[PDB]
Each structure stands twice: as structure tokens, then as C-alpha cells.
Amino acid sequence: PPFTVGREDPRYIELSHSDNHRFVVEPEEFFLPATPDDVVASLQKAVTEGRGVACRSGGHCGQDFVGTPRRDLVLDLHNLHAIGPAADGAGVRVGSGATVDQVQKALFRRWNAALPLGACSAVGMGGLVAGGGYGPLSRQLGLVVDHLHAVEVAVVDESRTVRLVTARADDTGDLGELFWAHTGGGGGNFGVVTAYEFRSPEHLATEPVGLPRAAGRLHVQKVVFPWAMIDETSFVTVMRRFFEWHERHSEPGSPESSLFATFFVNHVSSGVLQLMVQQDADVDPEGEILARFVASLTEGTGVVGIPRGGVMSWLTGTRYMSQADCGDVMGARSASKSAYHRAAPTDEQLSVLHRHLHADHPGQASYVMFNSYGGEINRRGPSDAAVPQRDSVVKSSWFSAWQDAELDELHLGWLRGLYEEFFAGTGGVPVTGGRTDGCYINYPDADLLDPARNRSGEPWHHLYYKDNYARLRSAKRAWDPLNTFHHSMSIGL
């Protein structure tokens, strides 16, 4: 059943934290709905009484969107996690409170199916889907939103009336706009999503629920490279080769689209760089492409990696390559920035990166992660979904995590220093339409709002949404005219 957790309830303390402990969520109360109807009734009460609301699914927000500005009510959606066949026609319905782990297990166990969900199994569908969603399978399957068929969402009209509407991929008029806005517009903007329905493009769909087939086996490999064996020149060589491989091998449908690499380029205090690579073993039984990719990175250089891994079944291999809600990632303070890369950075940029990775800094959880991108993602056009980046080949995440609030300035300083110098030639940000193509709204970065940090002249909304912002604003005016749903980086009326 549905229940409420107030300020005096002992569970409030746990609920007041999302994953990123830099931020706190302190409403007058949390409501934990059990059904979409519970969501509607809860929102209706709140909006009628003029109370401020927000929702939360997995709590993975990189920013303080849920708890800031101060809310009277937060709807925590984790009980809405049902997964099942879609009521009408093929496809699959997923409650917005389901986590990636729950979805991956259900899709595989029930239908031998897979969607391109991310590498962190605790992420909630709510925010992940609304912002686009990419993962290890995206070079084969595209973005999660590329499989979206419908969104069921609680919305608030100009008369303060809450309705549960369902917008479908084949809708036109206002409903068509609401559907499109959820294909990358980002969470916290239009209403409270209660469920998503997924139906894959014809060329990716298989029986019996119209989703893609999970690979029978995956090659999975993790290679550790000791920093002690790497000098600046070989670092630049390895990094350049990583990017150049992607420039060549990121076309939709190519054999190389079966491979996905994640390069953890760690601060030197970690002692090592770590390359993870996976490849669909159905496509390439011997894993030849993976082996050639890995070997090519360090050939000639004096750098020798220590590999581990093997060939695993799908669910076991996926978990081997994933990050769950356990251990040192829990209860941490963190900051992350993002960039889309259309082409290799210059060698000078790679030297800047090397220099900051050797700064005197407590960097045991500080790194830049470079992920393969493109492939099937790049089959669609920039305006087909709200996500506009459809010709990038590597996606980077720039990350630091730490424990003590007293070190916030230190860690934010290191991250900002690195990102801003790396992109100094373009105002300290990865501007669109050049070697880079802006940023990903699921790694939101409030520094992009500040002229001291962003001297590019390109506003946050263009870095995240490019030319799709106008249509998003129209959808916002139409569907959330009172700006009921808002946060520091919400779509403007």
C-alpha cells in the first residue's frame, strides 16, 4: 500500500539522501505511491493546496534537482517497478520506479531480451529514459529512447488539474509533442512519469515481445595498465589511438559496432589505467575484433597491460562489467561533467589531460571515463528525438568522488581545472558542431550556467539540446503551463 514518511519518521533520514551525498532532499514529507492512481491523487492534493512537488526514481541525479528548490512533497517512485507485456499489441511496459538491474533481469529471464540500458544497475528508469539513455549495447541498439513506444505521465494543466495521460510514438498534435519531449528532454520537466512502454524499431525487434535479442555470449575483458610504465608520450599515443579507432569504426551496422570499450583514465594516485571491453560473441565467436582493438592501442609503446576476463553468458557477463549499489560508491559526494566527441582531441589536449592526472591531488576516485559511442545511435537524425547528438563516436565522463564536505572545494577545483583547460580553446566547454558536440543531460553540470566556467557563449540548453530546445519549450508551455515541475536546469517556459 501507499504511505507517507514525515520529518519525525525514522525512515526520513535515509530518504533525505539520494545517491550523491553533496545534496540533501528535505521535504515536509515523502510519499511512496504504489500505483499510478496514487501518484495522480497525491499530486492533485499538493497542487490544489499550492504545495511544491518533485519526484525521484533511482536517485542517481548528478545535481540537486530533486531537493532544490525546497519542496513540500517528494514522491519517491521505487514501488512502481512492475514489468510486463504491454496491454495493447506487442512491447513491454516498465514502471518508472524500476532500476536498471530489475529491468535487465526481467527482460532476459522472461524473453531473452535486452535494451541498451546503462552500466550502473541502480539507476532508475524514470530519469534514465527521459534523458536519452546509453549503455554497452548502444552501438548495436541505439539509445533507450530509440525503443520508446509510449509514456504514461501525470501532468498538471493551467486549471491545476492533474491527469494521467499516455502519449504514444504514433500520436500527433499535443500528445505527439509530449511523447517526443520524453525522448531526451530530461526528467523533472513535464510531469511525473508512471511508466514507459518499449517497442523496438522493426530491424531490431524479435519475438515474442518485439524487443531485441540478448546475445548468447559476451566476450568480456578488463586490462590494467600500470601508470609506472606510461610516460606522457605513450599516454598521448594510447589515447589518440583509442579515439582514432572510434573515428574509423563507429558506423551503424559495421562489425565493429559489436564492440564497446570503457577506458577509465584514472588520476595517478590510483596507480593504474583500466580498459574494459566487451564484444558480442554471437557476432564474433573468436573475439577477433576485441583482441585486435586491445593490441593496437599499445603496440610499439613499452606499455604492457594485464588482462583478465573471458566469455560469459549474457546476464553474468553484463553484471561482471557493471557497477551496482554497493561498496565504495555508496554514501559518496561526487561531481561529474560530460562531453560528446565527434573526433579525436588534439595531442595538446591529451597532454593537458596527462598533466592534471599527475597533479598533487587525492585522486583515488578521480578519473575521466571514455566510452565507445555512435554505431546504431547515429542511424537517427538530430530532430527525430529530443537528444540531438547523432554523429559522435566517443562519450566522456569527467568524475571525482570523495567523502568529506570540507573537501568539496578541492575536488570541484581539480575537476573544473582539468575540464576547462582541456576545452580551453572553446571557452572551457565542449562546444557543439566541432571536434565535440556538447553534453548529455543525464550528466547535468550546473557550472555550465556560470560565465566564470563557461566562456564559450553557448548556453547550457544549446549544449544539451542544440536546435531541439525550441520544440521542448513549446511542449513545456503546452503540458506544464504553471511550471509545476522545475529545477536548476529545467526547460524554460
Ligand X SMILES: *Cc1cc2c(nc3c(=O)[nH]c(=O)nc-3n2C[C@H](O)[C@H](O)[C@H](O)COP(=O)(O)OP(=O)(O)OC[C@H]2O[C@@H](n3cnc4c(N)ncnc43)[C@H](O)[C@@H]2O)c(*)c1C
- Contact set with ligand X (CB under 6 A): 18-19, 54-62, 65-66, 77, 96, 118-120, 123-124, 126-128, 130-131, 133-135, 187-188, 192-193, 323, 442, 487
Among 308, 406, 409, 452, binds its own copies (CB under 8 A): 308
Q: Which does 118 bind (CB under 5 to 8 A by kind): ligand X, its own copies, none?
A: ligand X
Residue number with CB closer to its own copies (310 or 459): 310
Cis peptide bond upstream of 255, omega within 30: no
Q: Which does 147 bind (CB under 5 to 8 A by kind): its own copies, ligand X, none?
A: none
Q: Which stretch binds its own copies (CB under 8 A): 36-44, 104-112, 163-171, 391-399?
A: 104-112
Q: Which does 54 bind (CB under 5 to 8 A by kind): ligand X, its own copies, none?
A: ligand X
Q: Is 119 assigned to a binding site?
A: yes
Residue number with CB closer to its own copies (121 or 258): 121
Check: CB of residue 306 under 8 Å from CB of residue 229: no
Q: Which stretch binds its own copies (CB under 8 A): 5-13, 129-137, 145-153, 432-440?
A: 5-13
Residue number with CB closer to its own copies (97 or 132): 97
Q: Is 127 assigned to a binding site?
A: yes
Residue number with CB closer to ligand X (420 or 480): 480
What residues are paired with 340 via a beta bridge? 395
Distance in angstroms (rounded) separating the CA atoms of residues 447 and 462: 14
Residue number with CB closer to its own copies (164 or 329): 329
Regarding 268 and contact with its own copies (CB under 8 A), the answer is no
Distance in angstroms (rounded) separating the CA atoms of residues 492 and 460: 12
Regarding 57 and contact with its own copies (CB under 8 A), the answer is no
Element spanning 6, H or E: strand 3-6
DSSP letter at 117 equals -
Residue number with CB closer to its own copies (301 or 313): 313
Residue number with CB closer to its own copies (312 or 339): 312
Q: Is 440 assigned to a binding site?
A: yes
Q: Is 419 assigned to a binding site?
A: no
Among 62, 142, 317, 444, binds its own copies (CB under 8 A): 317
Distance in angstroms (rounded) separating the CA atoms of residues 443 and 422: 18
Among 121, 138, 237, 278, binds its own copies (CB under 8 A): 121
Q: Is 120 assigned to a binding site?
A: yes
Best CA proximity match to 108, nearest among 221, 215, 204, 202: 215
What residues are paired with 220 via a beta bridge? 278, 310
Q: Which does 324 bind (CB under 5 to 8 A by kind): its own copies, ligand X, none?
A: its own copies
Q: Which stretch binds its own copies (CB under 8 A): 14-22, 49-57, 153-161, 446-454?
A: 14-22
Tell which positions 182-221 bind its own copies, by CB under 8 A: 213-214, 216-217
> At a CB cut-off of 8 Å and minimum separation 6, what does 479 contact?
155, 174, 177, 178, 181, 190, 191
Q: How far is the CB of 3 from ligand X (least distance, A)?
A: 18
Q: Which does 288 bind (CB under 5 to 8 A by kind): ligand X, its own copies, none?
A: none
DSSP letter at 28 equals S
> At a CB cut-off of 8 Å and minimum separation 6, what does 43 contact?
53, 75, 154, 156, 162, 192
C-alpha gyration radius of the chain: 22
Q: Is 18 assigned to a binding site?
A: no
Number of residues that bind its own copies (CB under 8 A): 40
Check: CB of residue 207 under 8 Å from CB of residue 408: no
Angle CA 144–372–282, to nearest 5: 75
Tell which positions 319-338 bind its own copies, by CB under 8 A: 319-320, 322-328, 330-331
Q: Is 442 assigned to a binding site?
A: yes
Here's the x/- map for its own copies, 216-245, by CB under 8 A: it reads as: xx----------------------------
Cis peptide bond upstream of 36, omega within 30: no
Tell which positions 32-51 bind its own copies, by CB under 8 A: 32
Q: Is 220 assigned to a binding site?
A: no
Largest separation between any pair of C-alpha atoms in the chain? 69
Q: How far is the CB of 200 from ligand X (least distance, A)?
A: 18
Assign 3-class secondary structure to 416-462: HHHHHHHCHHHCCCCCCCCCECCCCCCCCCHHHHCCCCCCCCCCHHH
Regarding 14 and contact with its own copies (CB under 8 A), the answer is yes
Q: Is 60 assigned to a binding site?
A: yes
What residue ranges in 157-216 does DSSP mark as E strands? 162-168, 192-198
Integer CA distances (angstroms), 310 to 219, 220, 252, 290, in order: 6, 6, 26, 12
The three-state secondary structure class of 191 is coil
Distance in angstroms (rounded) separating the CA atoms of residues 200 and 245: 29
Q: Is 465 assigned to a binding site?
A: no
DSSP letter at 206 equals B
- Where do contacts with its own copies occur on this chain (CB under 8 A)? 3, 9-11, 13-14, 16-17, 32, 78, 108-110, 112, 121, 213-214, 216-217, 308-310, 312-317, 319-320, 322-328, 330-331, 403
Name the binding residues: 55, 57-61, 119-120, 124, 127, 134, 193, 440, 442
